[PDB]
Write a protein that binds this ligand. Structure first.
Ligand SMILES: Nc1ncnc2c1ncn2[C@@H]1O[C@H](COP(=O)(O)OP(=O)(O)OP(=O)(O)O)[C@@H](O)[C@H]1O
Ligand SMILES: Nc1nc2[nH]c(SCc3ccc(Cl)cc3)nc2c(=O)[nH]1
Ligand SMILES: [Ca+2]
Ligand SMILES: [Ca+2]
Ligand SMILES: [Ca+2]
Ligand SMILES: [Ca+2]
Ligand code: NA
Length: 159
């Protein structure tokens, strides 16, 4: 087994219902078990700002799936919950499931880059992560607690 950490975001079509559906779906992924779910946070959109606020959360998922097999499940859940690709970069969505971490692995394939390329710069990923994994160390040996102590990250509000 390995523990994967998944970032959850929704800003369309009733985020709270999309996130609660998605946690039921994540549970139904084979060879995999939810271990912890963070609080839900209401976060102002980064990138384009002319969109609703996000519900952001994180989940620890223990799995013996291969990492791209986990990605096939998360992308399926997203598509099943009405995720459509528009041309706008970083536009709104009903659900986004980003694989943050897959144990201590570093993965660079055609479809999957882990760690998530920009997570150490995003408080809406790091704060929920720290709530479920305060002791987390990244594959490069960086400590999640150290990143949040040393870097300026706005405080997150609960949904
Ligand atoms: N760690 C990962 N988690 C999820 N998808 C990934 C990951 N690494 C690469 N991808 C690939 O990213 C593609 C584009 O995803 P998407 O449109 O959701 O980007 P985004 O989540 O909006 O932006 P960002 O990555 O900046 O948060 C997916 O089809 C998938 O192949
Ligand atoms: N709060 C919130 N804002 C979001 N923006 C996106 S698109 C990625 C992105 C694009 C540019 C920058 Cl600089 C940072 C993030 N996803 C979320 C999300 O889940 N939560
Ligand atoms: Ca399961
Ligand atoms: Ca826009
Ligand atoms: Ca995504
Ligand atoms: Ca994303
Ligand atoms: Na298998």
């Amino acid at each position: 087994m390995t523990v994967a950490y998944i970032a959850i975001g929704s800003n369309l079509a009733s985020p709270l219902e999309q996130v609660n559906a998605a946690l039921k779906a994540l549970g139904d992924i084979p060879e995999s078990h939810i271990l912890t779910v963070s609080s839900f946070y209401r976060t102002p959109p980064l990138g384009p700002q002319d969109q609703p606020d996000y519900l952001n959360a994180a989940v620890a998922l223990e799995t013996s799936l291969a990492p791209e097999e986990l990605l096939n499940h998360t992308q399926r859940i997203e598509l099943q919950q009405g995720r459509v690709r528009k041309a706008e970069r970083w536009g709104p969505r009903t659900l986004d499931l980003d694989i943050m971490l897959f144990g201590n692995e570093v993965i660079n394939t055609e479809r999957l880059t882990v760690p998530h390329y920009d997570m150490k710069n995003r408080g809406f990923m790091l704060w929920p992560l720290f709530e479920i994994a305060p002791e987390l160390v990244f594959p490069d040996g960086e400590m999640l607690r150290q990143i949040l102590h040393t870097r300026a990250f706005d405080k997150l509000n609960k949904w």
